[PDB]
Amino acid sequence: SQFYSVQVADSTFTVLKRYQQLKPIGSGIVCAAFDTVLGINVAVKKLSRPFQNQTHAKRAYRELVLLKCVNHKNIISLLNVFTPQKTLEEFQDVYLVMELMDANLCQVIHMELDHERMSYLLYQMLCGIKHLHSAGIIHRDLKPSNIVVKSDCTLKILDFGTRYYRAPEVILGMGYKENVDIWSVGCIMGELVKGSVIFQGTDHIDQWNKVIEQLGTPSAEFMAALQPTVRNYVENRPAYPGIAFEELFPDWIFPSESERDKIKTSQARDLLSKMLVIDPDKRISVDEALRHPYITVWYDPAAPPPQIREHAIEEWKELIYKEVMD
Amino acid sequence: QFYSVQVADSTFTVLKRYQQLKPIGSGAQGIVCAAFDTVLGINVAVKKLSRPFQNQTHAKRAYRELVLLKCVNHKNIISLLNVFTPQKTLEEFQDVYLVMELMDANLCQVIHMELDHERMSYLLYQMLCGIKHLHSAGIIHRDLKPSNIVVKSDCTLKILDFGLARTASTNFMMTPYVVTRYYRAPEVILGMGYKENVDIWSVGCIMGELVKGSVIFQGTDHIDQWNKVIEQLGTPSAEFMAALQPTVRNYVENRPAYPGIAFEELFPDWIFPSERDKIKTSQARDLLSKMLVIDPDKRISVDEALRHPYITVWYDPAEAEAPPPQIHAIEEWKELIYKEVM
Ligand SMILES: O=C(Nc1cccc(-c2n[nH]c3ccc(-c4nc[nH]n4)cc23)c1)c1ccco1
Ligand SMILES: O=C(Nc1cccc(-c2n[nH]c3ccc(-c4nc[nH]n4)cc23)c1)c1ccco1
């Protein structure tokens, strides 16, 4: 096969000749490109020095294996993968070709969405997350910027797993389970409705303060699950009663141009109140969220789980190279 | 003070506040008129109990209706406004008039209309809510049909009565009846016992009729009712049939075998109401397939039907639950009923 090179935004992209007129859409570094075999625009991602250490190679091998095996309507589709190198010995760069979307969620936060659209977006998020959970993948890094949409309101998750969306248990260095991703969904949901970040901490420790001021000091039952030294910190914070959810998310920030909006507003606030819960023992699960009145309107009763670690940098390199070549 | 009026070949004697009586409903146990209430400035429904004191069953049922109507307070159960007797003493005592909120129609009247998914699911949500409130008070209706459900033009729906006492026996399909009983649950028809989801069969029959615009199981007589069930849903399991009373068991097992019709064929796409309607249609059919189940062991519960995608969209988590209600010789009944009236 033949390639050509183009300097794009401080970088040099060397790609198959089928991908033309590259233009940057984010930062792996990502370009939009016209595919002259398919006749469509695609997204071309050049992986950022994939084998510089232990972390990078581990991450990039995972991303590539998962993109190839996972097929769900709410997870980004891989269209092609290539390298401009011809041997394992000179092998340096990996290019991922993915479907091109219209926008990420940061951009939709700035608009005035009705209940139908908000609930449909949230339904899709939870569907994507459920599929990831069923494959043993707990994401932990969900945020507006790694979720993309089409103008017909289709939603896909970009990666397989920033401070503003981290669950209380992550902040306090506890363990976590599936519903760690529900906290993040609650944070994104709140922001879609409010137009601003719910918990905007100046640092990772100030994050806890932002949570406490709004939701209140968590229960003694929750405290019991902390190691004494971590609990000492938590209990030495000023005490907060928490703000009522009717006050946190007042009627006026919700759509209110018809009478049927009134009940959807009660439902949306109720779901928020179950997702934004400090104690993961008491926080809603993905399956229950999917059955919530606000969400379940989108469920159709009429997808197979995917057919799915420490190494030397050279051992990782041959693993990645094998994945690119088949 | 009272005055008398001849209404649809019956004589009503009512308080003078109740004026311009016009009949709206007939039948045994009660004759019903709309009346303008000059104290309240609204039209109401006046029901005269159809001879409450003829025997012990009549007096029992009349007492039960009155007690329950008084104690129950739920937005989907008919509200009682007043109760009175034209007689002045316990010795005189004879007639009972019940005054209730006036609605716009019986569900018989609005069933078969061209209704969208939004109105249909809303009516069904309301029915389920009333039923659940009854169940939580220990009341299982067992005889729900469109004629005991009433509606307003805004789609508000209420249940009109409390059906059969918990300890009442029913007659199975082999024992004749004159009237139509299109909504009777298979377990009642077959002589079985009943549990709470007896009422779910009725809702399924009502849901199907709202969608199709025709009675789902329209038997020519009491026995043909069962043939209409099996022709569409299919013969139930050997195990289920084997557990029936001999009279029933022998008939039912020697019936021709039917495979049943797929719910996509029974309730096809074109009978349902955009692209938003497509998922709702699919959800509606799914609920129907779970309600219209012969064997009560395999039939959906009221709680589960309320959480269904088709239904739960009308659930408001913020609104307060309605608190649960605070619950003989024919001449002892009279004194019991008189005290309730006064
Ligand atoms: O900006 C446009 N689209 C847009 C906007 C935001 C994301 C994507 C996007 N689609 N597919 C992807 C795969 C990966 C990434 C990725 N971003 C960081 N890292 N990776 C991003 C995408 C696309 C646009 C479309 C038409 C006219 O302008
Ligand atoms: O026909 C009208 N309304 C209507 C129609 C059918 C039922 C009711 C009804 N409202 N309240 C009730 C209480 C009991 C009964 C009852 N029927 C048997 N037994 N009991 C019935 C009702 C009302 C109407 C309203 C305005 C103009 O026409």
How far apart, in whole angstroms, are the C-alpha atoms of residue A99 and residue B149?
Answer: 54
What ligand 1 atom has the least distance to the C-alpha of A27?
18
Domains, chain A, in order of start with CATH, read 3-102 (3.30.200.20), 103-303 (1.10.510.10)
Query: CB under 8 Å, gap of 24 or more: what pairs does B331-338 form?
Result: B333/B53, B333/B56, B333/B59, B333/B60, B333/B62, B333/B63, B334/B53, B334/B59, B334/B90, B334/B93, B335/B90, B336/B63, B337/B52, B337/B59, B337/B62, B337/B63, B337/B66, B337/B93, B337/B96, B338/B85, B338/B90, B338/B93
B190: part of which helix (H) or strand (E)? Answer: none
How far apart, in whole angstroms, are the C-alpha atoms of residue B312 and residue B310?
Answer: 6
Nearest chain A residue to B122, by CA: A260
Contact between B232 and B217 under an 8 Å Cβ cutoff? The reply is yes
Ligand 2 geometric centre to CA of B97 (Å) = 15
Give the three-class secondary structure for B92.
Answer: coil
Contacts of A21 (CB under 8 A, 6+ apart): A33, A34
How far apart, in whole angstroms, are the C-alpha atoms of residue A208 and residue A230?
Answer: 12
How far apart, in whole angstroms, are the C-alpha atoms of residue A4 and residue A95?
Answer: 13
State residue B10 phi and psi, 5-degree precision.
-140, 155
Contact between B82 and B46 under an 8 Å Cβ cutoff? The reply is no
Residue listed under structure tokens 């039923």:
B131
State residue A307 phi and psi, 5-degree precision.
-85, 75
How far apart, in whole angstroms, are the C-alpha atoms of residue A170 and residue A181?
Answer: 11
Size of interface A-B (CB pairs under 8 A): 37
How far apart, in whole angstroms, are the C-alpha atoms of residue A211 and residue A214?
Answer: 6
What ligand 2 atom has the least distance to the C-alpha of B103?
10
How far apart, in whole angstroms, are the C-alpha atoms of residue B110 and residue B105?
Answer: 7
State the sign of the Cα–Cα–Cα–Cα dihedral A234, A239, A241, A243.
negative
Task: Specify the resolution in Å.
Answer: 2.1
Tokens of A178: 């599936």
Residues of B labelled catalytic: 143
List, in sequence order, the alpha helices (H) in chain B.
56-71, 107-110, 117-136, 186-189, 198-212, 224-233, 238-242, 246-253, 263-266, 276-291, 302-306, 309-312, 330-341
How far apart, in whole angstroms, are the C-alpha atoms of residue B198 and residue B302?
Answer: 10
How far apart, in whole angstroms, are the C-alpha atoms of residue B256 and residue A5?
Answer: 77
- Tell me, letter by letter, the H, E, C secondary structure of chain A: CCEEEEEECCEEEEEECCEEEEEEEECCEEEEEEECCCCEEEEEEECCCCCCCHHHHHHHHHHHHHHHHCCCCCECCEEEEECCCCCCCCCCCCEEEEECCCEEHHHHHCCCCCHHHHHHHHHHHHHHHHHHHHCCCCCCCCCHHHEEECCCCCEEECCCCCHHHCCHHHHCCCCCCCCHHHHHHHHHHHHHHHCCCCCCCCCCCHHHHHHHHHHCCCCHHHHCCCCHHHHHHHHHCCCCCCCCHHHHCCHHHCCCCCCHHHHHHHHHHHHHHHHCCCCCCCCCCHHHHHHCCCCHHHCCCCCCCCCCCCCCHHHHHHHHHHHHHC
β-pair partners for B42: B37
CB-CB under 8 Å, A293 with B318? no
How far apart, in whole angstroms, are the C-alpha atoms of residue B49 and residue A73?
Answer: 61
Question: Is residue B120 packed enough to be buried (19+ CB in 10 Å), middle (13-18) or exposed (0-12)?
Answer: buried
Of B37, B64, B36, B70, nearest to B52 (Cα)? Answer: B64
Contacts of A116 (CB under 8 A, 6+ apart): none
How far apart, in whole angstroms, are the C-alpha atoms of residue A284 and residue B113?
Answer: 40
Question: Is residue A61 packed enough to be buried (19+ CB in 10 Å), middle (13-18) or exposed (0-12)?
Answer: buried
CB-CB under 8 Å, A302 with B286? yes
Residue listed under structure tokens 């010795």:
B91
Contact between A13 and A22 under an 8 Å Cβ cutoff? The reply is yes
Rounded to the nearest angstrom, the gap between the alpha carbon of residue A40 and the centroid of all alpha carbons in its chain is: 25
Q: What is the largest CA-CA distance in chain A?
A: 67
Edge-to-edge strand list for the sheet holding A95-99: A19-26, A29-35, A40-46, A95-99, A78-82
Tokens of A139: 């994401």
How far apart, in whole angstroms, are the C-alpha atoms of residue B147 and residue A314?
Answer: 79
CB-CB under 8 Å, A297 with B286? no
C-beta neighbour count of B240 within 10 angstroms: 18
Ligand 1 geometric centre to CA of A155 (Å) = 12
Of B280, B267, B272, B334, nearest to B308 (Cα)? Answer: B280
Contact between A180 and A171 under an 8 Å Cβ cutoff? The reply is no
Asked if the C-beta of B328 comes within 8 angstroms of chain A's C-beta atoms, the answer is no
State the sign of the Cα–Cα–Cα–Cα dihedral B270, B273, B277, B282.
negative
CB-CB under 8 Å, A298 with B279? yes
Would you put residue B322 in left (φ > 0), alpha (ψ -120 to 50) or beta? beta
Contact between A17 and A32 under an 8 Å Cβ cutoff? The reply is no
β-pair partners for A208: none
CB-CB under 8 Å, A291 with B316? no
Closest-CA residue, ligand 2 atom 8, reads B103
B interface test, pick of A119, A249, A261, A297 with most B CB neighbours within 10 Å: A297
Asked if the C-beta of A25 comes within 8 angstroms of chain B's C-beta atoms, the answer is no
Asked if the C-beta of B286 comes within 8 angstroms of chain A's C-beta atoms, the answer is yes
C-beta neighbour count of A142 within 10 angstroms: 28
Contact between A109 and A191 under an 8 Å Cβ cutoff? The reply is yes
B32: part of which helix (H) or strand (E)? Answer: strand B30-37
CB-CB under 8 Å, B316 with A266? yes
Contact between B282 and B211 under an 8 Å Cβ cutoff? The reply is no
Taking contacts as CB-CB distances below 8 angstroms, the residues of chain A near B125 are none
Helix axes B117-136, B276-291, angle to 10 degrees: 30
Contacts of A191 (CB under 8 A, 6+ apart): A109, A144, A197, A198
Taking contacts as CB-CB distances below 8 angstroms, the residues of chain A near B285 are 302
b/e B46-60 (16+ beta carbons within 10 angstroms → b): bbbbbebbeeeebbb
State residue B169 phi and psi, 5-degree precision.
-90, 155
Taking contacts as CB-CB distances below 8 angstroms, the residues of chain A near B316 are 263, 266-267
Contact between A225 and A211 under an 8 Å Cβ cutoff? The reply is no
Residue A278 annotated as part of some ligand binding site? no
CB-CB under 8 Å, A299 with B313? no
Asked if the C-beta of B258 comes within 8 angstroms of chain A's C-beta atoms, the answer is no
Nearest chain A residue to B275, by CA: A298
Taking contacts as CB-CB distances below 8 angstroms, the residues of chain B near A267 are 315-317
Give the three-class secondary structure for B128.
Answer: helix
Helix axes B56-71, B330-341, angle to 10 degrees: 20
Give the three-class secondary structure for B109.
Answer: helix
Asked if the C-beta of A267 comes within 8 angstroms of chain B's C-beta atoms, the answer is yes
Ligand 1 geometric centre to CA of A43 (Å) = 7
To the nearest whole angstrom, how far is the Cα of B269 from the nearest Cα of chain A?
13
Smallest Cβ distance to B312: which of A269, A296, A298? A296
Closest-CA residue, ligand 2 atom 28, reads B104
How far apart, in whole angstroms, are the C-alpha atoms of residue B292 and residue A303?
Answer: 28
Asked if the C-beta of A152 comes within 8 angstroms of chain B's C-beta atoms, the answer is no
How far apart, in whole angstroms, are the C-alpha atoms of residue A13 and residue A22?
Answer: 9
Ligand 1 pocket at CB < 6 A:
A 25-26, 28, 30, 43, 45, 76, 98-104, 148, 158
How far apart, in whole angstroms, are the C-alpha atoms of residue B155 and residue B133?
Answer: 19
How far apart, in whole angstroms, are the C-alpha atoms of residue B288 and residue A80?
Answer: 45
Angle at A72 between CA A70 and CA A77, to 5 degrees: 70
Method of determination is X-ray
Residue B73 CB-half CA count within 13 A: 11
How far apart, in whole angstroms, are the C-alpha atoms of residue A314 and residue A320?
Answer: 10
Asked if the C-beta of B282 comes within 8 angstroms of chain A's C-beta atoms, the answer is yes
Q: What is the DSSP letter of B77?
A: B
B4: part of which helix (H) or strand (E)? Answer: strand B2-7
Q: How far is CA B11 from CA B6, B14, B15, B143, B341, in A?
A: 4, 10, 13, 29, 20
Give the three-class secondary structure for B7.
Answer: strand
Ligand 2 geometric centre to CA of B201 (Å) = 25
Length of chain A: 326
Query: Which one of A141, A159, A261, A270 is the catalytic residue?
Result: A141
State the sign of the Cα–Cα–Cα–Cα dihedral A76, A78, A84, A88.
positive
Smallest Cβ distance to A263: which of B279, B307, B316? B316
Of B53, B213, B60, B80, nearest to B146 (Cα)? Answer: B213
DSSP string, B158-175: EE----S-TT-----TTS
Closest-CA residue, ligand 2 atom 25, reads B104
Tokens of B42: 């609204």
Of A146, A221, A226, nearest to A185 (Cα)? Answer: A146
Q: Parallel, antiparallel, or unpaired: how do β-strands B80-84 and B42-49 relate?
A: unpaired
Contacts of A261 (CB under 8 A, 6+ apart): A115, A254, A255
Smallest Cβ distance to B309: which of A263, A270, A296? A296
Residue listed under structure tokens 């890094």:
A141
Q: What is the DSSP letter of B87?
A: -
Q: How far is CA B319 from CA A266, B158, B315, in A?
A: 9, 18, 9
What ligand 1 atom has the least distance to the C-alpha of A98?
13
